[PDB]
Amino acid sequence: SLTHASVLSAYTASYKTTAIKSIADNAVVLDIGYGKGNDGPRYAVRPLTVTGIDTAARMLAIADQNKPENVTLVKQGFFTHITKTSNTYTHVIAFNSLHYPLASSHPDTLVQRLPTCPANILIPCHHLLEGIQTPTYSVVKDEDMWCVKVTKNEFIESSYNYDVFVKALESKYHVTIGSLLDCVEKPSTRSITPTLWTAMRNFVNNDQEMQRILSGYITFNLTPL
Ligand SMILES: Nc1ncnc2c1ncn2[C@@H]1O[C@H](CSCC[C@H](N)C(=O)O)[C@@H](O)[C@H]1O
């Protein structure tokens, strides 16, 4: 229950819990890469109007099976969505998704095309995760591709220019940068009891490899200039 992957999953849920609670009441939210809808229950209990987008139709089909009434699912990738939509967004959420379009675009193009509104971004910084090798979490660079193994699952990802992305964000927003290591809030996830969360935070405080994993998942709290 205290594997590196389980603790990473809980800390990710902690950040998502705090970020979604922090959105201004009644915001019109764009969630980039909504996927299978893990954040559905967090949006469901808030006064928010949410549009969840994704490039993969199969992922959105799963999200539809239990989607809240305040979430609308659109099968469009970020760049195509921002062009076509009539919506005016007042908050942008992007949890572990932006590194995909950043790998195929100039980071200033992605940043300039984001709606000019507050945002929360969680993104792996591959250069800070490289070489971490634990039984349930590993990141290796194979030629030009990143192989991120999380338990018995492997994500193959392309490189993106993290350094250019951070400078692009600073040109458009007041940026507050952090990482998952900064999280203290218990995830909304009912399966993570207060006793389990206490044990996970105690493990993080005592294990440098776990700290390195959480430190490589960068958080950005953005307010437009
Ligand atoms: N260009 C793009 N625009 C929108 N979504 C994209 C994208 N490239 C990849 N994605 C999607 O981004 C998702 C990342 S997985 C994370 C899903 C969800 N945000 C969560 O935190 O649980 C995947 O579903 C993937 O299909």
Residue numbers in the entry: 24 to 248
Text lifted from the article:
Interestingly however, we and others have identified a putative N7-MTase in pp1a (N7-MT-1a) of several members of the large-genome Tobaniviridae family. The WBV MTase is therefore RNA Cap-guanine specific, with a strong preference for methylation of an open (GpppN) cap structure.
The WBV-260 protein crystallized in two different space groups, C2 and P21, with one monomer per asymmetric unit, diffracting to 2.6 and 1.7 Å, respectively. The two structures are almost identical, with the exception of the last flexible C-terminal helix that is not visible in the Tantalum-soaked crystal. AdoHcy, the by-product of the methylation reaction, is found in the active-site of both structures. The central core of the WBV N7-MT-1a adopts a canonical Rossmann-fold (RF), with an alternating βαβ structural motif, characteristic of the class I family of MTases. This core structure is formed by a central, seven-stranded β-sheet (ordered β3, β2, β1, β4, β5, β10, β9), flanked by α-helices on each side (α1, α2, α3 on one side, and α4, α5/α6 and α7 on the other). In addition to this central fold, two other structural features are present; a flexible ‘3β-flap’ domain comprised of a short α-helical loop followed by three anti-parallel β-strands (β1 and β6–β8) and an α-helical bundle (β2, α8 and α9) wrapping around α1, herein referred to as the α-bundle region. As with other, class I MTases, AdoHcy binds in a deep, predominantly negatively charged groove, formed by the loops between β1–α2, β2–α3, β3–α4 and β4–α5.
